C-alpha cells in the first residue's frame, strides 16, 4: 500500500506537492528517510508526463505542480515557472533512460529529534 506520514489526507496531499516541486526546482534536497521514500514515486510519475509532451499530459501535471518561479530570464524580463522547466528542461534530459530518475543517499541522525536524514537528488 502507501504510508501515512503522521498527517491527515489533506495535509499529506499538500506535503507531497511541495516536496515534489522542490526537487524539480533545486534538484537536490534534504528530507527524512520515510518522507523521501514517498516523493520517490510522485516525482518519477511526473517526469513520465513530461516525456509525453502532450497538452493532455501538461494539463494533468499542472494539477500537481505548485505555481512558483524557478528563475527569471530576460528573453523582456519574463519569469520561468516550475511547470515550464519540468517539460522543457528536466524531461528532455531523461529521453533515453527508462526508469529510476532519482537516487537516495543516507546521511545520519538529526540532532534535534534523532530523525534519519537523507539526500534525494534528481539524476
Amino acid at each position: 500500500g502507501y504510508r501515512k506520514l503522521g498527517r491527515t489526507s489533506s495535509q499529506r496531499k499538500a506535503l507531497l506537492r511541495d516536496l515534489a516541486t522542490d526537487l524539480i526546482v533545486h534538484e537536490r534536497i534534504e528530507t527524512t528517510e520515510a518522507r523521501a521514500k514517498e516523493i520517490r514515486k510522485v516525482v518519477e510519475k511526473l517526469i513520465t508526463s513530461g516525456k509525453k509532451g502532450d497538452l493532455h499530459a501538461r494539463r494533468q501535471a499542472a494539477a500537481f505542480i505548485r505555481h512558483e518561479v524557478v528563475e527569471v530570464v530576460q528573453v523582456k524580463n519574463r519569469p520561468v515557472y516550475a511547470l515550464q522547466k519540468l517539460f522543457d528542461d528536466v524531461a528532455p534530459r531523461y529521453a533515453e533512460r527508462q526508469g529510476g530518475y532519482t537516487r537516495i543517499l543516507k546521511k545520519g541522525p538529526r540532532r534535534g529529534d534523532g530523525a534519519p536524514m537523507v539526500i534525494i537528488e534528481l539524476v
Binding site: 543517499l105 543516507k106 546521511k107 545520519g108 539526500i119
Partner: protein
Amino acid sequence: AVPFRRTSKAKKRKRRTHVKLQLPGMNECSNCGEYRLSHHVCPECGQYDGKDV
C-alpha cells in the same frame, strides 16, 4: 495500582539487565581510512561508493 512493597536493590538491578544500548555498526572508510556507518555517506571525505557527493 499502588506499590505494595518497595523494590530492593537486587530486584531493581535485575530488571535493568536489558536497558543497555547496543554498539553502533560502524566501518572503516576505504578512501580516507577512518570510521563511518555502513550504507552511509562518509562525513569526513564526503564520499560514497568511491564517488564524491
